[PDB]
Structures are given as C-alpha cells and as structure tokens.
Amino acid sequence: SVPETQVSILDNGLRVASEQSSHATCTVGVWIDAGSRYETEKNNGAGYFLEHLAFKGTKNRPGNALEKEVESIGAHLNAYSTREHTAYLIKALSKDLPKVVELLADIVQNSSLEDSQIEKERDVILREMQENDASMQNVVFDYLHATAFQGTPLAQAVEGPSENVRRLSRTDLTDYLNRHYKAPRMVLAAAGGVEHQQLLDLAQKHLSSVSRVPCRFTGSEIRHRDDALPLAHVAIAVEGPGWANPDNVTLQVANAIIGLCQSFQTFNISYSDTGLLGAHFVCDAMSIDDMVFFLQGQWMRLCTSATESEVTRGKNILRNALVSHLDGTTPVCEDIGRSLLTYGRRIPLAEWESRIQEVDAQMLRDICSKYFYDQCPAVAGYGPIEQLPDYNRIRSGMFWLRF
C-alpha cells in the first residue's frame, strides 16, 4: 500500500522523480553523480569547496538576498557531499513548491562563485579541517579508505588535503562545476506533499538548461599512534560487493546479527561495484586486542555456525530499519535521489521485503564465507593502539583452524 515512486526524464537527462504523500511539507533535492571519486588529485577539494560556495549567491540572486528568500518561506536548506554523490536539498511547505524548485535551479546552474567568498570559504574550510582532526571516527574511517583503496581515487577524502584547499581557483571550480554537473547525471527528487505533474512542469520550466555532456581494495594497515588520546578507534573492513549486487541485502542481515568495546558499529559502505564491509569500535587501550578477538570470532561464527533464530532476528531488525527510515520526507527524498543515481530506479519496499524473506541461514553463511572468510582486511587505528595486533594476527583471526 506504499505509493510508488514515479520517474520521468527530460531531454536533458535529468530524471525528475517524485513520491507524493499527504504530509504538507516536502523535501525537494537535487542529486548529482559527482564526488571525490571523480576528482584527479589536482582538484581534490573542488566538490567540498563548491558545496561551501553554492549558498553564497548566484547571478540572478546576488549574495545573502538568495538565502533571504529561503528564510522568507521558512524553508530549510541543506547540502552534503560523499565520495560518489552530492546532494542539495530543501525542506519546505507544499504551497511553496515552485520557488523552491527555482531556487534549486540557481544552485545547480547560474551559480556565482565570488572571488571574495573564495578566500573566506578557504579560511572556513581550512580551519574546519585544521579542527576536523578532532573527530576521531572520521579520522579512522578516512584512514581505512586510504589504506584500503591505495593508489585509487577512492582513497582521497571528500575534503581533500589542505594543500589543494589553499591552491584552488574559480576556474578550477568552474571546471568541476561544468564537468561534473551534467544533466544526465542529475536527479530532481521530491518527497511528500507534491504532485508529479506539477514538479515535472517546474523542471521543464527551470532546470531544463542543464548541459548534456579500476576500483581496487588493498588488504593493508594504517596505524596512527598518538598515546595522549584517552580512547582508541579501530575500524576493520573487507571488500564490499557494490550497489547492484543483491547479496548486500544478505550482508545487511549479517550486520543486523552483530548490531566489549564501548562502542561497536557495523557498516556496509557501498560505492559503484565496490565497498567497505566491516566494524568500527572505540576502546581503551588495554581492551583493544580482546575486542578484535571477540569481533573476529563473531564473523567466523557467521561464516560457519549461523542458525535460523539469529537470521530471523536479523531479518526483523533489517525490515524495521529500512521501514523506520524512509519515514520522514527528507529521509525519503534522499532515498529517491540515491536510488535513481545508483540503481537507476527506485526499489519499492515490497521488493526489499521479498529480498529479505528469501534470505535464510544457509545462503547467509555462504555469502559471509564468500566475503569474510580468509580475506585480507584493511585496518585503521588511531589513539593508544600499541596493543592493537599487527597484520599477521588479524589475518590469522580471519579464519579458523577448525573451520
């Protein structure tokens, strides 16, 4: 009984997708297939710095008058950038649907990058990075990406190195903007109280101008030892399947089974036919090795001794999860934008439920043995990590002598 997500396509290739609902406020966003993976180490912070500059005024709406408009209807303006996708989204009322779309049009095209602003946003970005190091789990996940995807464009961070940040100019930005903002790589997603025909007419009216035009995991280890920190963050991952491979669903159930360290989180990060599947835990130094041992045992148990009850529990946790999420308008629009960018279509919740209920214990331990057993992991540690075991002990913990 969930309403279907209807997708149309303009000549430009900008797929305009919408999923109407009763709620009177909507989350209209633009999703662009452009991240740090498309950068070539000479413009490693171009997407981040453009994400900073995108709200500082356009040609038609110069400066803060633009954001005065998004204050005037009381709407909320957000943007984010990952290694593969960039999103500019607005939460607003339903009756303010046209102007919001027009605002989004300016943000993607006709944007103005002021040289004055460029210096101010450089100091913002530089400073934030200079303090970003504070967030450990971000440092650990960046270290994990770097050591797992050495030599590839997937190792480099979204923010880029301070070097590039300082060394960036309007023209470079202009390039990234004019290169990675093509209309066939763009989705206009709407969720909530929107009509699809009105949104399609608004996309035809504005946004109809957008121009139309080997990933490798390396089993490795990075250890940033700094003994003055009170807690240690350790992430261990193996290679993921990618977006389009359905056993992701089964792997999600495996994560739902795992769900000793103060904080233990499992992740399945997916990129275009690659990814990182693993666990991040933050712990006191004198516990670290025991955690690792614990964690590896659970993975091998999922490779060898999965039972039906924990599989049923993981399926229930996954169902609830995906359905708990996909609740508010934003979460949904976000799903529409990512689904049109990655799968090329919006997968409905009934298909997700079918793919969940076809998962049993035998195929779960088969897929877990395919992806976890006897695999070389990527390890990233930060903090008092002397008792964190080196690569032979972790690699030996990636299998059992008793199977």
């Binding site: 050591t147 490795s220 990075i222 250890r223 940033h224 030892r225 700094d226 003994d227 130094a285 070389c376």
Partner: protein
C-alpha cells in the same frame, strides 16, 4: 605487556598484507648491493685479527717443523 610498553605520539605507520605484496621484492636486485654495502662497513673491523691468526698459525706450524728438523751442525 602490549598497551603499556611505551608512549609515542603522531607516528603514523603504514603496512601491506602479505599476500598483496611480492614475496621477494628485488631480492637479488638490491640484496647483493646491500650485502656488499654491509661487508664494506664491517670488513676492516672484523678481518685483520683473523688474518694475523692465520699468519701466527702458519708461523707456528713452520717454526715447529724447523724446530723438529735435525740440527745439521749437531751430530757432526
């Protein structure tokens, strides 16, 4: 034990998986140069004592023989 051995700071340490790297990277490529590099930093400290051991050993042997060799002048 591990964890309480020492205090270091800001020393990042990168590494690779055994199966991901060649087993004998440039083994004879640089091994020979290095072994030779090594031998030339230690040969002057090591070798001349054993050289003079060889000279003393030979000397002793020959001297001993001469010692044993009958004195021609004697017994005549």
């Amino acid at each position: 034990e591990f964890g309480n051995l020492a205090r270091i700071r800001h020393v990042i340490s990168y590494s690779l998986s055994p199966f991901e790297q060649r087993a004998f990277p440039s083994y004879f490529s640089k091994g020979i140069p290095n072994v030779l590099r090594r031998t030339r930093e230690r040969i002057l400290r090591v070798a001349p004592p054993f050289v003079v051991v060889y000279l003393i050993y030979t000397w002793g042997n020959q001297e001993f023989e001469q010692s044993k060799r009958k004195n021609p002048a004697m017994y005549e």
